Symmetry: C7
Subunit: 261 residues, 7 copies
């Protein structure tokens, strides 16, 4: 598993969940996302009914609608970022685990036979496939696209969120539209939206790292073949290879040394 992309993924997941959990902790801290005026004649309950009404009224200036739903959309993005990892955890990971374990021992046998090519034949045959490299391309890029719409959404959010912290709510509705004690609209403040707009900029800012970093992961001709992706697995899993390290030190140095190694 490619660590940076994995770490980027792990971090990309941590941020919103943190933000969401804190928003929840803040929603737990605030208790409501909105409030409105009332007449002072509105009882302690009557005003509570207004607040809850307008909090419900949101689904009927369009961002004012979205402003309520904003946090859960974030959660949607978080889930949408996570699942490609579980998907990728099966698109390719079951293949490579077998691949590496084979690759290791045959190169160790190349190493061992040198001390005293089936993986190369296999690997330069994996060269033939475009399937698993395109598996990587699609799985990563799709995940990347999740970030794009979030950032665009957060941008389209933030840009207009800056001007739409408040609205006037009517609860003069139905039969109790006829109650004149209800002002035709209450003015209402979308309490969390400033936090969210801040949170939005925060997440957006950090996500503006993750996007081109994953883009950087595709410049493999400068980092076209599964081999080139195996070369990533090489650049990756050299991590696993004692004999490579030994032979790389040998290569660094260059049967006595092999006898000493």
């Amino acid at each position: 598993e490619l660590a940076v992309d994995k770490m980027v993924t792990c971090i990309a997941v941590g941020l919103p969940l943190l933000l969401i959990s804190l928003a929840f902790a803040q929603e737990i801290s605030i208790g409501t996302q909105i409030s409105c005026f009332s007449p002072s004649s509105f009882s302690w309950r009557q005003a509570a009914f207004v607040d809850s009404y307008c909090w419900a009224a949101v689904q009927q200036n369009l961002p004012l609608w979205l402003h309520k739903f904003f946090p859960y959309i974030l959660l949607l993005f978080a889930i949408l970022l996570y699942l490609p990892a579980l998907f990728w955890r099966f698109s390719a990971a079951p293949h490579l685990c077998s691949d590496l374990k084979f690759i290791m021992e045959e190169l160790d046998k190349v190493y061992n036979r040198a001390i005293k090519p089936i993986v190369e034949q296999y690997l330069k045959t994996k060269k033939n496939s475009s399937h698993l490299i395109m598996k990587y391309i699609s799985c990563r890029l799709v995940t990347f696209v999740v970030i794009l719409l979030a950032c665009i959404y957060l941008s389209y959010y933030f840009s207009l969120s800056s001007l739409s912290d408040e609205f006037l709510c009517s609860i003069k509705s139905g039969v109790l539209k006829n109650d004149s004690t209800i002002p035709d609209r209450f003015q209402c403040k979308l309490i969390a939206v400033g936090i969210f707009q801040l949170l939005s900029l925060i997440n957006l800012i950090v996500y503006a790292l993750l996007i081109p970093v994953v883009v950087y992961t595709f410049f493999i001709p400068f980092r076209y073949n599964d081999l080139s992706l195996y070369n990533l697995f090489l650049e990756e899993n050299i991590s696993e290879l004692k004999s490579y390290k030994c032979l790389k030190v040998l290569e660094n140095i260059k049967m006595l040394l092999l006898t000493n190694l």
Copy 2:
């Protein structure tokens, strides 16, 4: 266990539980699902009694009834999705575990004997049964049907939920129907229903993936026999087979190689 279908199942379970837990966290965040007006003359308690009354009144426009019960119905679907896995965990899983473990060693003996057919006789005998393939068909499809009614329910919910966010509640009832201070009906907002209608669309949208994906799992003639289902277990459990990987690399390459392998 078929990973995608398993993952689909694991995910299909995660979503509603997440949605339900957040709805609970939201119910914990909101504290009530409904409120109503009162006269300002209704005490801080008297108005509370109205709210609770109408929250109870729900069981006596029919979706307004269902709107209350909505979340727990979701929980019902979640349980209804889970149990087929535990059921399937015994319909077939005890069979295949023994099957695979047998299949492995005899094909390894085919492999070993080749290096220096009982599973094939067994497998091409499993070809005879329709019982375990029909076990799969029913167990999966039933689980799939759980999704169907949920989505239909959420659709029948959402389509009319869009118009029925509120109602007028009468608590002028019994002896205290005679109290004229009680308005014959209070107007009442079904606070969570917008969230739920959103949540409904969310779950519906994601479930509209899971359904045809499981449908795709049945196109085995393009992915009629337990063997064909064993061919799935083949396409599955090749995951387990060192010698297959070795022989597939051998097959990729093709006694020296067997001696080297």
Copy 3:
């Protein structure tokens, strides 16, 4: 341990605990199970005293009494379902564990001796006892009876719960019967009863599966002896038998194969 009956048991326990925990979570969500009117002249506390009074008044139309106690009765059923498993975990499980472990090795010796009858003598002697089969019958059926009264209770509950969501409560009592500001009865809504009546139907519906399923477990002549119950342990614990699987494959196929097996 018979998986379906065990799973049925595990599930039969999960449902009410879930329902109860959610009812608790709902009781935590609602904070009270009941409320009543008051005069508006009843203070914010005075009305609270009414509510709590009537919530206490329940123990003095009889289901209105029971309606309060309803949840804990559910908990009673849940405990009553659980303990037969712990009881059964000792009525028979210590016997069979020794039985199976003996049975395995001697049939493996039959298997081994065939490759190159004490369990049969023992098993066809276990044929003599009615004690352990009657242990099963009673332990299961008793557990089953727990379900019967619950469902009957929930039915007797639900059928009249449908009509008795509310009552009028008198707190004009004792010395403070003489306070005329207290209405001779307050009208009172049994807030949770609708949820409970829903919950009751839910649990009842699901329990109407578990009952005849366990009944189906007794049709052993179509699924009279401990052997017949050992035949269940056979139909069960063939799960454990490598050699049975081998010999069943051998039986499927039919010393070379035994030499190959």
Copy 4:
């Protein structure tokens, strides 16, 4: 450890802790165990002071006193039931663990010597002691006595609890006895007592099982010596004896069988 008595003990502990925890969860759910009227002129705080006063007044019709303290007395019984197990866990358990482990191997040597008496000499010497059997008698019976007083207490509780759900509380006390706005007594409802009286009957009912069951455990002449208690350990720990099972099967069947066994 004698499973039924142990299970009975484990269950006997589970019930009250469950009841207590739920009572706590109910105390958490209710927030107070009592309330009283007030004049409506008593402030939202002044009435709160009454409630808390009378909740404190309890220590100065005697069961009304006890009714408050009731739950913690239950907790007392629960602790009082638990500790005899820890006590018994040392009164006898360190002895028998060594005893069984010795007994096993020497009877296995009797078994082994038969294949190709020190425990019997030891056991029929343990016959001499009355100390460890009286250790059992006292430790169990004492635990049993805990149940007796609880049930008697719950009975003496329940029988009069049925009539004493409420009382009149005076907070006209000290200097602020002179405040005439305070009614000489407030009427007060002991909110939890109905639950507790229910809980009391529940626990009592279930404890009326546990008592005679433990009594049944003493009818050893029909289930006088440590041997007879070792015969219980026999009837118990035959659970541990492979060779007994083998020899019991041999005994069931009856050197070839010993050679086969």
Copy 5:
């Protein structure tokens, strides 16, 4: 580690922590330990200020002062009981662990040499020291003294707690001594003190067991030397000695038996 004294210690720690945690759970359940009257003219906040004031006023009839601090003093005793175990866990436990492990193998060698005295020389040399026995005496007795003052404190508490459930509080203080709307004293009820006085009697009653039991642990001449304390470790750690059990059975019976043993 001496089990009874250890168990006594473990239990002696469990009780107050339980009582304290429940008091906390009760403090969490009650929310305040005290309340007072107010004029009804005192606002919902003004009366709250009184309550909190008098709750603070406690530090300026002396037990009324202590009554507030009571719970944490209990916590003090609990910590004060615990730490001697950690202290004792190093005063002696590192010595004896080495001692026992040595003692075992040399007596096993006495046992083994008998089959086919250094510990006795060592032990009857440990006879010389008074240091480690006085380590026990002081460490235990000190712990015991913690109990004494608690019980005395609880007694001095309880005896006067019985008469001092309430007091009159002045918040007519400082500049706002000049506000005549403040009554020169409010009457105030020390809400938890009844629970605490109950709790005090409870803990006292149970601690009146633990004290003389530990006293009973010192009657070693009837249960003067480290050997006598080693004789306790003997009476203790015979628990560890296979060969003692074997030789005690041998001693019970009395080279064939040694050959059989």
Copy 6:
């Protein structure tokens, strides 16, 4: 991993998370970060609306804006400090783990060959690279820079926070700007800012340790090459080297000793 720098890092992370968690616990303890006056004519809800309004108004004297966002900025710094460790955990840690494990065994072979140079050739070749030392420099310094801006931010915060604990808030806004009952501005206290300003000084003070300590970590010429960084890994991982310790003791002492060693 360099322990001090690691410990410094671990501690540098612990402090703010502690401060943040306590601020959250304090936000949980306070429930709001701000409040304002109202007219007494503002209802219990109307004043609540003011408070929440002004709490939202923050995003429209600039530090008053920032004062709200302050805590989450701290959280930002905490995350910003953490991730360089995970980054560094891959920038270098996969290299050195292989390096050390190689280095150990070859120096042990130097040790072993001495008893009866490939690592030196490798290490004095690592001398060639500037890549991994610059990896350290950048990764640490960047982390260090996180501290700089925090401290500067906290300074720019604290210095002006000292004068800007409060502000006047206008909620006379929109349509409900026209309500004259609303004072054109409410005066508002930024409740947490004193805690935060304290917290700021606290964190700043402690961070003024961590900064130059990490600076001290760069004075390697007094603590220019990867070798010099390997000399740190030497000064570090001598921790791992038995033979170094042995040979250092040998070096301390100086084939008999090697034969004795």
Copy 7:
């Protein structure tokens, strides 16, 4: 690790964290640390604003300022006590672990060679260094100094805390200094300060043990060299030495015994 000093440290850390956590639990129990009067004309919110204002006003008789910040200063001391252990865990612990493990085996070889001096040469060379003994001196003493200022702080706290439980707060400030309904100062009670002053005395009292105990740890000439500190490690880690125990028993007794040992 020196157990007493370690235990002293572990305990020294436990106490404040306990006190702090309980203070938090008390802050959670109280909900506020302060309250003030208001005019009764101050709304339920207006008075709340006063309370929060004065709670914020603290940062502008100086101990009244500190009284708020008191708990977190305790937390500061707790952290300040902890970190020297982690520091010491690296100042010396990595050295001694290697030291002991070497020391053991060479003295075991002295033991073994005696049965049939490199550590002594090493140890009496460690005699040369003052570095690691001064490491101990500074690390411990610094930790000790943390206690000093806390106790002094708590003393300077307690001594004046005794007289400064309350103050008068002005919220007549800014524009809303001009509101005459605000009393020029409210009188305010620093609710927690009595608990804290109690807590302060508690912690101080217990810390007055820990200080001279650690002082007692320095009287090594009566408990000047690393050897003398190794003699502590001797007096310490004799805990680890089987052969020392054996040879100490041998020394207690004094090749047969060595042959028997």
